[PDB]
Design a protein around this motif. Structure first.
Motif, mmCIF file in Angstrom:
data_model
loop_
_atom_site.group_PDB
_atom_site.id
_atom_site.type_symbol
_atom_site.label_atom_id
_atom_site.label_comp_id
_atom_site.label_asym_id
_atom_site.label_seq_id
_atom_site.Cartn_x
_atom_site.Cartn_y
_atom_site.Cartn_z
ATOM 1 N N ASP A 24 0.794 -1.231 0.000
ATOM 2 C CA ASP A 24 0.000 0.000 0.000
ATOM 3 C C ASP A 24 0.829 1.286 0.000
ATOM 4 O O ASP A 24 0.282 2.367 0.259
ATOM 5 C CB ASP A 24 -0.979 0.018 1.182
ATOM 6 N N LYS A 25 2.125 1.221 -0.313
ATOM 7 C CA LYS A 25 2.998 2.390 -0.321
ATOM 8 C C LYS A 25 3.263 2.862 -1.750
ATOM 9 O O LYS A 25 3.226 2.068 -2.692
ATOM 10 C CB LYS A 25 4.329 2.070 0.355
ATOM 11 N N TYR A 26 3.519 4.160 -1.916
ATOM 12 C CA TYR A 26 4.138 4.597 -3.174
ATOM 13 C C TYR A 26 5.595 4.177 -3.173
ATOM 14 O O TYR A 26 6.252 4.204 -2.131
ATOM 15 C CB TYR A 26 4.066 6.113 -3.360
ATOM 16 N N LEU A 27 6.118 3.800 -4.347
ATOM 17 C CA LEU A 27 7.484 3.309 -4.455
ATOM 18 C C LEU A 27 8.257 4.089 -5.509
ATOM 19 O O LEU A 27 7.698 4.519 -6.517
ATOM 20 C CB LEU A 27 7.521 1.815 -4.871
ATOM 21 N N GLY A 28 9.555 4.227 -5.282
ATOM 22 C CA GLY A 28 10.450 4.758 -6.293
ATOM 23 C C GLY A 28 11.477 3.709 -6.648
ATOM 24 O O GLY A 28 12.371 3.405 -5.840
ATOM 25 N N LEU A 29 11.332 3.108 -7.833
ATOM 26 C CA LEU A 29 12.231 2.047 -8.283
ATOM 27 C C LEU A 29 13.446 2.663 -8.966
ATOM 28 O O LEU A 29 13.339 3.233 -10.058
ATOM 29 C CB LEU A 29 11.516 1.085 -9.227
ATOM 30 N N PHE A 30 14.605 2.497 -8.351
ATOM 31 C CA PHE A 30 15.858 3.091 -8.803
ATOM 32 C C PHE A 30 16.708 1.973 -9.406
ATOM 33 O O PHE A 30 17.257 1.143 -8.675
ATOM 34 C CB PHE A 30 16.554 3.777 -7.632
ATOM 35 N N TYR A 136 -4.442 12.036 -8.844
ATOM 36 C CA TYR A 136 -4.511 10.643 -9.277
ATOM 37 C C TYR A 136 -5.136 9.826 -8.148
ATOM 38 O O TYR A 136 -4.514 9.623 -7.100
ATOM 39 C CB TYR A 136 -3.109 10.145 -9.629
ATOM 40 N N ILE A 137 -6.357 9.351 -8.357
ATOM 41 C CA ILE A 137 -7.089 8.596 -7.339
ATOM 42 C C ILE A 137 -6.802 7.104 -7.489
ATOM 43 O O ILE A 137 -6.865 6.553 -8.594
ATOM 44 C CB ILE A 137 -8.600 8.882 -7.414
ATOM 45 N N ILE A 138 -6.516 6.448 -6.365
ATOM 46 C CA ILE A 138 -5.975 5.093 -6.316
ATOM 47 C C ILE A 138 -7.051 4.131 -5.839
ATOM 48 O O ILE A 138 -7.651 4.341 -4.779
ATOM 49 C CB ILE A 138 -4.744 5.031 -5.390
ATOM 50 N N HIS A 139 -7.291 3.071 -6.613
ATOM 51 C CA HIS A 139 -8.075 1.945 -6.120
ATOM 52 C C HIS A 139 -7.147 0.888 -5.546
ATOM 53 O O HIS A 139 -6.316 0.346 -6.284
ATOM 54 C CB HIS A 139 -8.928 1.341 -7.220
ATOM 55 N N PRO A 140 -7.258 0.554 -4.264
ATOM 56 C CA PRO A 140 -6.331 -0.407 -3.671
ATOM 57 C C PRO A 140 -6.446 -1.766 -4.339
ATOM 58 O O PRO A 140 -7.423 -2.078 -5.020
ATOM 59 C CB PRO A 140 -6.779 -0.481 -2.207
ATOM 60 N N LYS A 141 -5.421 -2.581 -4.123
ATOM 61 C CA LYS A 141 -5.342 -3.917 -4.694
ATOM 62 C C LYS A 141 -4.675 -4.821 -3.672
ATOM 63 O O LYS A 141 -3.600 -4.490 -3.162
ATOM 64 C CB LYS A 141 -4.553 -3.901 -6.010
ATOM 65 N N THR A 142 -5.316 -5.935 -3.341
ATOM 66 C CA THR A 142 -4.678 -6.908 -2.464
ATOM 67 C C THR A 142 -3.918 -7.948 -3.255
ATOM 68 O O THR A 142 -4.302 -8.330 -4.363
ATOM 69 C CB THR A 142 -5.667 -7.641 -1.552
ATOM 70 N N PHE A 143 -2.840 -8.417 -2.649
ATOM 71 C CA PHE A 143 -1.989 -9.445 -3.207
ATOM 72 C C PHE A 143 -1.841 -10.548 -2.167
ATOM 73 O O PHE A 143 -1.982 -10.303 -0.962
ATOM 74 C CB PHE A 143 -0.637 -8.844 -3.619
ATOM 75 N N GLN A 144 -1.597 -11.777 -2.631
ATOM 76 C CA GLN A 144 -1.495 -12.886 -1.690
ATOM 77 C C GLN A 144 -0.307 -12.704 -0.759
ATOM 78 O O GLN A 144 0.763 -12.241 -1.166
ATOM 79 C CB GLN A 144 -1.391 -14.224 -2.420
ATOM 80 N N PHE A 145 -0.521 -13.043 0.516
ATOM 81 C CA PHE A 145 0.475 -12.865 1.570
ATOM 82 C C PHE A 145 0.983 -11.421 1.650
ATOM 83 O O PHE A 145 2.101 -11.170 2.130
ATOM 84 C CB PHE A 145 1.634 -13.845 1.379
ATOM 85 N N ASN A 146 0.164 -10.469 1.185
ATOM 86 C CA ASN A 146 0.515 -9.043 1.159
ATOM 87 C C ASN A 146 1.848 -8.789 0.447
ATOM 88 O O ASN A 146 2.573 -7.843 0.771
ATOM 89 C CB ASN A 146 0.527 -8.454 2.575
ATOM 90 N N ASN A 147 2.168 -9.615 -0.551
ATOM 91 C CA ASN A 147 3.395 -9.481 -1.334
ATOM 92 C C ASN A 147 3.027 -8.965 -2.726
ATOM 93 O O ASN A 147 2.463 -9.701 -3.540
ATOM 94 C CB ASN A 147 4.126 -10.819 -1.403
ATOM 95 N N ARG A 148 3.326 -7.694 -2.991
ATOM 96 C CA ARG A 148 2.969 -7.044 -4.250
ATOM 97 C C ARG A 148 3.968 -7.276 -5.379
ATOM 98 O O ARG A 148 3.740 -6.788 -6.492
ATOM 99 C CB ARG A 148 2.862 -5.536 -4.025
ATOM 100 N N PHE A 149 5.088 -7.948 -5.125
ATOM 101 C CA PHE A 149 6.223 -7.852 -6.038
ATOM 102 C C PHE A 149 6.193 -8.845 -7.194
ATOM 103 O O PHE A 149 6.837 -8.589 -8.224
ATOM 104 C CB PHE A 149 7.523 -7.997 -5.235
ATOM 105 N N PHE A 150 5.451 -9.952 -7.084
ATOM 106 C CA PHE A 150 5.260 -10.785 -8.272
ATOM 107 C C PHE A 150 4.519 -10.017 -9.358
ATOM 108 O O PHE A 150 4.903 -10.048 -10.533
ATOM 109 C CB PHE A 150 4.507 -12.069 -7.922
ATOM 110 N N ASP A 151 3.438 -9.334 -8.978
ATOM 111 C CA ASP A 151 2.684 -8.519 -9.921
ATOM 112 C C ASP A 151 3.537 -7.381 -10.467
ATOM 113 O O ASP A 151 3.448 -7.035 -11.655
ATOM 114 C CB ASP A 151 1.443 -7.963 -9.221
ATOM 115 N N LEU A 152 4.355 -6.767 -9.601
ATOM 116 C CA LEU A 152 5.141 -5.607 -10.018
ATOM 117 C C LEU A 152 6.268 -5.999 -10.967
ATOM 118 O O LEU A 152 6.503 -5.303 -11.962
ATOM 119 C CB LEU A 152 5.699 -4.875 -8.793
ATOM 120 N N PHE A 153 6.966 -7.121 -10.698
ATOM 121 C CA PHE A 153 8.198 -7.460 -11.409
ATOM 122 C C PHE A 153 8.077 -8.604 -12.411
ATOM 123 O O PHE A 153 8.906 -8.688 -13.322
ATOM 124 C CB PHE A 153 9.313 -7.842 -10.425
#
Length: 155
Positions: A24-30, A136-153
């Motif tokens: 649920d955080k904004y991220l900056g991918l460097f 920019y209005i955000i609709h939240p999204k749940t991910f399994q085990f609260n791990n967003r990174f499979f979807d992200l990467f």
């Protein structure tokens, strides 16, 4: 299982954090590397950015040749980082040309600013970016085990 932990330096120790922290955080991918001269310079821009946008978590996606380069980079910054690995598949997913790159990500993994490295180098952006985040209005999204990174990467 994918990307269960990220890493950081604190108290002269290498430490891990559960990747569920980033939910649920904004991220900056460097995307960067200690051997990339413009990547080291870019840290100065990132540090100004972070003070103005303190809720955004900076995550280092590394392209160092060696683990010891990676450790140096993690020590000299205070950023969170992916574990030292080969992340070209992340470059491929987002069609990343060069290093450094910097993407801003919303809490549901949607991209806020894809080419944010060039934006924050203009050094005249805070006001537009703040209104962009506001509008920019955000609709939240749940991910399994609260791990967003499979979807992200990964797909």
């Amino acid at each position: 299982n994918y990307m269960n932990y990220l890493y950081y330096y604190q108290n002269n120790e290498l430490k891990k954090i559960d990747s569920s922290y980033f939910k649920d955080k904004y991220l900056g991918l460097f995307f960067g590397a200690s051997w990339c001269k413009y990547c080291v310079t870019f840290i100065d821009s990132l540090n100004i950015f972070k003070k103005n946008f303190p809720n955004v978590e900076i995550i280092y996606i590394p392209f160092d040749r060696t683990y010891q380069e990676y450790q140096s980079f993690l020590k000299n910054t205070n950023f969170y980082a992916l574990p030292f690995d080969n992340y070209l598949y992340i470059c491929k997913k987002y069609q990343i040309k060069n290093l450094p790159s910097f993407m801003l990500i919303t809490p549901n993994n949607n991209i806020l600013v894809k080419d944010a490295a060039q934006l924050i180098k203009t050094d005249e952006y805070i006001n537009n970016l703040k209104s962009l985040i506001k509008n920019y209005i955000i609709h939240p999204k749940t991910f399994q085990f609260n791990n967003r990174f499979f979807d992200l990467f990964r797909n």
